[model samples]
Target: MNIFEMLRIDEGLRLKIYKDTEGYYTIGIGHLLTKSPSLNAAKSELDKAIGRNCNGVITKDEAEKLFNQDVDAAVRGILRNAKLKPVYDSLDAVRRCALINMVFQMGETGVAGFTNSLRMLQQKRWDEAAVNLAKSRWYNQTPNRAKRVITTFRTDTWDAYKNL
Candidate 1:
C-alpha cells in the first residue's frame, strides 16, 4: 500500500498531521500512529535540522539517537507546567495535533503571542496564507521551511500540505 492507504487516512488528515506537528509528516493517530521507519527518518531529519541551526552536522543515526534523548528531556520539561492549556480549543483532532506539534517545535516562547498567521489559520483564510505565515521571527530563523509551508498553504499542493 502507499503511505496513505497503509495508514487509511484521507488527504485532510494527512495534511492536518503535517501542519499540526512541527516537522512530522507521517500519520496514524498519535505518536504511535506513525510507522517506525518514518518516525526514525523524521527524528534523523529533525536532529540534523537542530544541528544545522545550532551549528553542527550529525549522521542520520547519530541524529536519531540524540533527538530521542533531547525530546524526552524536552517533553518532561513541558509536562512540568501543569497549568498550561491549549489556546485554540475548538480545533479538530488534526488541527489540534498540528498545533501541538508546532508549539513543540517552535516553543511557546518563539510564537510569543497570538498573531495574524494563527488568527488566519483559525479563520481558515487560505488565500492570505502566505502573509499570515511570515508574521514571526521564525521566518528570519528558518526562511526555507517557513516559505515552503506558506507556499503550500497558498497553492494547496497536497504534498506541501502533508509535509509542510
Candidate 2:
C-alpha cells in the first residue's frame, strides 16, 4: 500500500482534538505529546481545532516553539540538499519562512524538484515564482495552501501554512 494509506491506517486520520490512550491531547495523524520541539512541531497541525480548548492542551507559546523547531529543521534540510544556503540566507524573513514552510510540506526532495520555481526565486522573479508554483501538481493537490505560499513568495508576506 502507499505511504499515505499506510499512515492513515496506522495513525488514524483524526481531524479533531482527541486524547490518545495515554490521555495527552492529540490531533491529526500521530502527533504524540513531546517536549522535543521537532517532534512537537511535527505533531502541530492547524485545522478547525485551533481555538478549541481541551484538558491537557499545550499553550500557544509552546506550540510556536515546536513549530519553529520544525521549520528550522526543514530549512536546514533544504539548505543541505539544494546547496542554496547563501540564497536562502539572503531572503527576507517572510520569504524565508514561506520557503521553509514549502520545504516542510514538500520535504527536501520535493522542494528540490521545484527547479523552475527556485530559479525564479533566486533571480528575484517573484511573479514567475508564483506562476511556477501554481503549475505544479502540489498546487493541484492542495490549492489553498499552494496559493497562500505563492502569495507569500510574491508579496513577501507571512501567510504560509503552519500545520504540518
Candidate 3:
C-alpha cells in the first residue's frame, strides 16, 4: 500500500501517526485531538504522517495515489479543471503545498479561481497574502477550516517546518 493508504490519511481528515508505547507506528484520527508529548515531538510525528517518501517532493503519481480515494475526489475534481501547470510553474514547494492542501480541502477550481489571492502570494506580501486567505467565501463559509489554514500560513507551520 502507499504510505498514505498505510496511514489512512484521507483527504480533509487529519490522520494521526505516532510511535506507540511498544515503538510501532500507530495510526489514528485527528492528531490535533490528542495531547502530544511535546511541541517538537508532535511536529516530528505529524511530519512523518503527512510526508512523502521521496524527500517531500509530491510527484504526480504520489498526488494521484493520495487523492484518488473517497473524499479525495474533491482534490481530483479540482485538478481536473485546474490550470495546475501554471501554478506548478510559478510557485516553490512551500507555496505549492499550501495551495494544494487548501485546494484539496476546498476544490481546485475554487482555489484556482482566487486570482487576487494568487497574485498577492506571488508578490510575497505575507500579510496581504494572509488577508487574501481570509477574504475567501470558504473563509466566510467555513470558519474552522479557514482559521486552521490561516494559522498554518501566518505561523509558518503550513510546511510543517518546526523550527521556522
* Stretches of model 2 off by over 4 angstroms after superposition: 1-68, 159-164
Instruction: Quote the lDDT for 153 in model 2.
Output: 81
TM-score of each: 0.40, 0.57, 0.46
lDDT (CA) for every model shown? 0.43, 0.60, 0.50
Where does candidate 1 clash, by residue pair?
Answer: 20-98, 21-98, 22-101
Q: What's the true lDDT of residue 82 in model 3?
A: 42
Pairs of residues at least 3 apart in sequence or in different chains that clash in candidate 3: none
What digit string (tens of lDDT, one per residue) describes model 1 on residues 1-164?
12222122222222122323334443222222223346455545444544543222334454344445534543444344332233344344344333434444455544435466666666667677468567767677666656644554455443543553
Please give, for residues 113-132, the per-residue lDDT of candidate 2 as tens digits: 77777888888999988987
The regions of model 1 sitting more than 4 angstroms off are: 1-62, 65-89, 92-101, 151-158, 161-164
What does the lDDT read for residue 112 in candidate 1?
Answer: 33
- Give per-candidate clash totals: 3, 0, 0
Where does candidate 3 stray beyond 4 Å? 1-84, 159-164
Which of candidates 2 and 3 reaches a greater lDDT? 2
Q: Which ten residues in a row have the lowest lDDT in candidate 1?
A: 6-15
